[PDB]
Write a protein that binds this ligand. Sequence first.
Ligand SMILES: O[C@@H](c1cc(C(F)(F)F)nc2c(C(F)(F)F)cccc12)[C@H]1CCCCN1
Ligand SMILES: O[C@@H](c1cc(C(F)(F)F)nc2c(C(F)(F)F)cccc12)[C@H]1CCCCN1
Ligand SMILES: O[C@@H](c1cc(C(F)(F)F)nc2c(C(F)(F)F)cccc12)[C@H]1CCCCN1
Ligand SMILES: O[C@@H](c1cc(C(F)(F)F)nc2c(C(F)(F)F)cccc12)[C@H]1CCCCN1
Ligand SMILES: O[C@@H](c1cc(C(F)(F)F)nc2c(C(F)(F)F)cccc12)[C@H]1CCCCN1
Lengths: 326, 326, 326, 326, 326
Amino acid sequence: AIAQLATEYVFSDFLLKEKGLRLELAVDKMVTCIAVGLPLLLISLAFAQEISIGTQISCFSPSSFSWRQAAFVDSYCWAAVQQKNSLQSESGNLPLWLHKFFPYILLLFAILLYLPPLFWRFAAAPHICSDLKFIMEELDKVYNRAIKAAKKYPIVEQYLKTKKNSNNLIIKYISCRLLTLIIILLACIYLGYYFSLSSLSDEFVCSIKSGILRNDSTVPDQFQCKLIAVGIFQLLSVINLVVYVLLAPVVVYTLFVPFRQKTDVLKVYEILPTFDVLHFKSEGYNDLSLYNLFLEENISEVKSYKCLKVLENIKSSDPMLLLTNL
Amino acid sequence: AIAQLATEYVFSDFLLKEKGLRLELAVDKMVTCIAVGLPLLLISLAFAQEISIGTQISCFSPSSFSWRQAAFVDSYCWAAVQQKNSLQSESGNLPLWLHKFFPYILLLFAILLYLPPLFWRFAAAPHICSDLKFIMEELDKVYNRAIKAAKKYPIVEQYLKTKKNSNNLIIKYISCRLLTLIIILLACIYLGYYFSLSSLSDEFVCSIKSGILRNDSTVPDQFQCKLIAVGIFQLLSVINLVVYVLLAPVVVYTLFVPFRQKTDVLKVYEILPTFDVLHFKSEGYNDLSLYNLFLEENISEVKSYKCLKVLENIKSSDPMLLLTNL
Amino acid sequence: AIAQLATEYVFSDFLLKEKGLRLELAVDKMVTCIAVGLPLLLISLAFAQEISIGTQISCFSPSSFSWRQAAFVDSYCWAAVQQKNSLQSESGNLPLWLHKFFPYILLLFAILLYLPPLFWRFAAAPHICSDLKFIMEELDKVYNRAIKAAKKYPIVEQYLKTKKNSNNLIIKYISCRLLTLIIILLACIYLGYYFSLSSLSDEFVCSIKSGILRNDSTVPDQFQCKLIAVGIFQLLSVINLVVYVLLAPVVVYTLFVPFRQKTDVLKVYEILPTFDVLHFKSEGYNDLSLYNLFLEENISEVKSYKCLKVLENIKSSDPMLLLTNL
Amino acid sequence: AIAQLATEYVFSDFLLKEKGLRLELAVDKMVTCIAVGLPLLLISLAFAQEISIGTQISCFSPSSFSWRQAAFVDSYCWAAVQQKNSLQSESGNLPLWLHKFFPYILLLFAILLYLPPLFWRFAAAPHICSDLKFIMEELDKVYNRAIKAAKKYPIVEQYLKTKKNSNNLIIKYISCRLLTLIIILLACIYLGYYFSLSSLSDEFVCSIKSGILRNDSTVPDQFQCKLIAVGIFQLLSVINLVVYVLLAPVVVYTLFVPFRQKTDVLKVYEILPTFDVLHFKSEGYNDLSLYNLFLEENISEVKSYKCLKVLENIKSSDPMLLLTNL
Amino acid sequence: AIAQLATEYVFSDFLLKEKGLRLELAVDKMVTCIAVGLPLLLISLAFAQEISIGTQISCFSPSSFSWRQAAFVDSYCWAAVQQKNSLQSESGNLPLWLHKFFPYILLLFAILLYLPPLFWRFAAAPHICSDLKFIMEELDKVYNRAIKAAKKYPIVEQYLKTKKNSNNLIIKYISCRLLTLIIILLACIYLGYYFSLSSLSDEFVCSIKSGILRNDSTVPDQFQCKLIAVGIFQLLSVINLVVYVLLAPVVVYTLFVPFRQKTDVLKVYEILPTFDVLHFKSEGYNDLSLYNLFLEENISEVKSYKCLKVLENIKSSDPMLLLTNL
Ligand SMILES: O[C@@H](c1cc(C(F)(F)F)nc2c(C(F)(F)F)cccc12)[C@H]1CCCCN1
Ligand SMILES: O[C@@H](c1cc(C(F)(F)F)nc2c(C(F)(F)F)cccc12)[C@H]1CCCCN1
Ligand SMILES: O[C@@H](c1cc(C(F)(F)F)nc2c(C(F)(F)F)cccc12)[C@H]1CCCCN1
Ligand SMILES: O[C@@H](c1cc(C(F)(F)F)nc2c(C(F)(F)F)cccc12)[C@H]1CCCCN1
Ligand SMILES: O[C@@H](c1cc(C(F)(F)F)nc2c(C(F)(F)F)cccc12)[C@H]1CCCCN1
């Protein structure tokens, strides 16, 4: 059912569950889930039980034709939207090709939108995963040492600086998001072209006259056929186009990594006396700018950051309290 | 539904899940999943609920024929694409054979593409599994001994050298990938031949005249039949051919084992004082070249390598810090 | 769907999962899975949704006959391939019997191929299971004692010798594999005979004239019927015959137990000083020859064998290292 | 599908899984699973998707009759195999009754074959369960005491003797197996009678003339009907009869409890010095003869029996080794 | 399928699983499962895929009537077995009412048979549950104290006596079993009356003449209708009646609580020296008579009772052995 479909896609997890670590920050998962599942959701809505009257093409055989003769006419003209010579139409052969393969094309866009998140989930996900969990563990060790002192060389600061120098991972990230934006724009171009079709493009005339039926006495020369659900495809197309047009500015915002403005989440550790590491922050296209965003995603999960952020918040309203907080 | 099919194949795990150890390195799993599942995905897309109008062959019986007489004509000509004498066609009997058994042939290619990964998952997978987990355990023991020293005979170096001498496992690996490449090229040849068919090959004429109906007064001599979804098969064929043509250079890259260039992942252990083992690396077709790749897959999972790689990265930006890192 | 069927049989576990111990060595599981599941897979492929046009037999009733009268003709002639007198055919009654009961016969061969692995999984599996896990535990105890010595009577050697004397279990194993080979050859004989049928054997004429219709004025004397999917059965038959013809040499290789040549897997324990047991190996048809093969299957899982095999491999490139390896 | 059915019954567990203890010894589970599931398997094979052409009875209404009039004729004669007066047939009313209720009768035999294993699984299963696990625990305690001595009153011997005196449980067991054998013989009698039917018993003539249609001008006096799949029922009947005829000697062998000849499995404990209990064995119809068989099923699972049997086997090739074995 | 139905009801658990404690003793679960599930099993067998020819009522419209006109006739007469005036029949309106609502009536009997076990599983199950597990725990404590003594006031004896005085729980139990017996007898009365119907009760004549069709020129006055599967209902009715007639003596045996004769299961604890409690047993309708039966169900699960019963059994073939048994 359509409601079972809605629970399957919109209200279920879908590509959201896949625990301690989150290697796909906010917006990414949101953008990927909407962009991938909305062609799937709208295809499945296109052919729901309630909305599909029946056979997609009907062709108006004469009354003299039998049941299976009309079945031949319908099935032949369904197959004969493909070849050029068999049919004539005012719009042309290309919009009928789009009408037949609308769900194929939208599923192709869904898979194409799934490709850059997948290439992220293999090529760059283990590196960000291992590096971020190591940084979380090291920061927990630093706070444990500070708490022990309250009751030599900071590895985290220099390991943060050497990734400030590197920019391979951000190049992978911006390549993923740029491919996603390009595919969204191409899907917008297709959906705008498809919805802008006259809606008489589904109307066409086909002749069942190839082969021996070219020189048969009693067959109609041509058969009026309509591709049913083309209007449903156009309605779902404008819906998909509207949602993708809303989604594309979010992706363009996602491209600008340094503008995202993490609100001094790493600066909270600078307040502690022992933790002299991680004072600075990125101001450009580097790996560290992306590490700051994945940190700002995953740092609330850290044991110590929440306590030290509470210590910072009460200041926002002497470090004796920190010893007391433990 | 087509969307349920897409979630079943593209977005689900498929042949990806099957934890601590990964005995199928990157690209392999990617190439195997795409090459195996894309014939499955495109077959299931070929006969989706929306795209299938109904019966695959219709044959245009006369109006005088009843419903089940036309059913006989359709079913007989479906069966009679097989035998040579029963039908005549401009293209021939072979393309009609391909049209009837297109999903059989693509599933045969999917299983044939699944064979070399399966022969890897039995013949060579236990050996690489046991050897790699032993190497991981030994390297963890070496780092534990080094950390204990900081706070005689390295088995790993000589056990690495004796596999430098051996080349049975790489012969198995290159045999698997060569069989995969050969099957991909054969599938490309078939899909190029199938898509290059004129698309009037589906059109054919069959006579329901074998047996007693040879000398019956009132039956048509021949019946115009079209194999519906042959154009859908050709569209999915060019899609499969395009994806496999993209996939084949990746397999050819996968053949060249020593060119893969692990970026001194084993050299990180040379920096430690106690770990004097594993200084060198392969420069040819040996088992060690494949062990380096499986190592570079699985070494990020190792406890010690990540810490010692952080120690190497800060140098990239005295070993006192290592004692401090613990 | 056919792709769901393929994931159910070829790509899923099937008779592969059913952990620490493997009481069905390599090839056995491979041969059993292919031989059992390929009739199942090809039957399910025979009647897939895409390939089945509809009713399996159609019979060309006259136009005067109604819908349910033609349904009677089809259903009667389906039932009347059984009895001899009701029909006449050029090939005979036996090939039509095979055409009706092709999936029954191939499923019978699948179950018959499943019988010897099942009789192995009950009659001989507990004995090999208990004996092999006891041998693994005893060898682990021997290596633990050797490691303790490095830092009286070997039970394993004499318990190995007394099974060298016995040959009941190998008789059970060779009986299982001989029954499997005989059933494979019988299936090859059937599939070769079935594929060699002319493919006009499906064509036959039946008379709906038994009982009161013997002396009815207006019924045709005989009705041209074709058994649809017989050509599909013949194509799947030659596929099954080709795969079984490939499989039979593997079973014949599996019969020769002593020729299998375990590569001194038990000899690795002879290198240790304390482990003076298990020096020799079989050179004939005994239980010990089969125990060597199940050992060579399961010995990589053993804790100590991998370490001592690494010690042997570095030698292949004084036992001081063993004390160091621990 | 038929292959899904085969995986559901033959290749799945079925009545095999239902861990440490096995209260249904070998052959019993085998005989119960085959005898119960083979009527189920052959019924489900009788009405598979491929083998069922459609409606089971067709009756050849005149061409003047409409679609639903022929539907009435088919449905009425299906119902009117029951009453005697409505139909006439050469064979009689009883074989048509068997043809209509063949799957009911075979399922009745399946449930009747399931009754004695069920009455075993309630009436006698807890007693054999508790007694056998107590005997296993006591024998483990005896070997633990013997191992402690190596490094007064044996309860097991007298508790074994008092069950030598009793014979209630063996009476229950032989009653179960005798009921199973009697039901197998009755099923063999039915299947032999059913297969021996002429196969024109399915042919019969029925009159739709009860009630107001007795005195209606235009209806045929009688309608030629065939019960389709009766030949399929006869083929499956001879298959079931052959398998049950093979199964019945196994049940007759299962009746003779003392002849089963446990190979001195309890005598292995006599070799130990401390374990002076359980020297003798049954030579008649007693509870102890059945306890020996359930012991010989479950004693390989025991920790100590395997070690002491290894000690016995090396002798088969001074008890110093036992102290060493531990 | 019918075989899937059989695995769902007969061979699966059904109302058998619902672990340490069993608050529904033997026979109860057996009687409840058979009595509840056999109407369910026979209803599901009544409308299996193989046995149902199609529409349950067919009515023999004239040939002039169209397809949907005959559909109206069938559907109207199905609805018009309800009202008295619309139809006339030799048997009457009541047996046609039973024929239409046979599965409703048998499901009503199944639910009515499920009511007394359900009222047991709420009203009396917690009390017997808590009391029996407390008695098991107290007896285990008594044996632990006796074993400690071997190496003041018995609460169990007086707590057993005060429930000897009470009879509320046995009144609930006998009310449950009496309601079950009464419902079984009522179902037997119904099934005997239903099977004793002439089997021409399914034959009836209905007039589609209410409303505007009372004064329409061309409709038949009355239509011969048969309710198909009424004979199947009668066969399943005699099967259900036979099984319930067998079941009713078991329920009548279950009513006599004190006659059930627990074989001195509580007397085994009297043999121990410390356990001076629970010497006597019931000889009438009391709560203690039911507690003895639930004890004899659940006492084999007790740790100590099995050991002390082994001590009693060897006597059946000085208490020094008990100290030795521990
Ligand atoms: O909730 C899921 C969802 C799916 C889809 C669609 F269609 F992609 F599957 N569409 C949605 C729409 C929309 F407006 F687009 F319809 C609005 C809101 C949520 C939608 C998503 C969103 C991100 C987090 C959870 N998975
Ligand atoms: O995601 C799965 C996938 C399957 C398939 C197909 F069809 F093989 F099943 N096709 C895919 C395409 C394609 F472009 F080919 F359509 C593009 C991207 C992913 C595809 C794969 C890939 C590897 C890791 C996870 N399993
Ligand atoms: O992978 C499974 C498989 C099944 C089948 C079939 F058909 F038996 F089910 N056929 C297969 C073919 C074949 F060429 F025969 F088609 C080729 C490769 C694998 C096949 C098997 C094999 C052994 C280990 C895992 N189970
Ligand atoms: O494997 C299962 C099986 C079921 C059936 C049937 F039909 F009873 F379900 N038939 C079988 C046949 C037969 F020859 F009879 F077909 C041969 C071999 C195994 C069969 C059984 C057997 C006992 C252990 C596992 N459950
Ligand atoms: O096994 C289950 C079963 C159900 C049914 C029915 F029909 F109630 F569901 N009928 C049965 C018949 C009968 F003869 F009655 F058919 C005979 C034997 C067992 C039957 C029951 C029995 C009690 C323990 C397990 N649940």
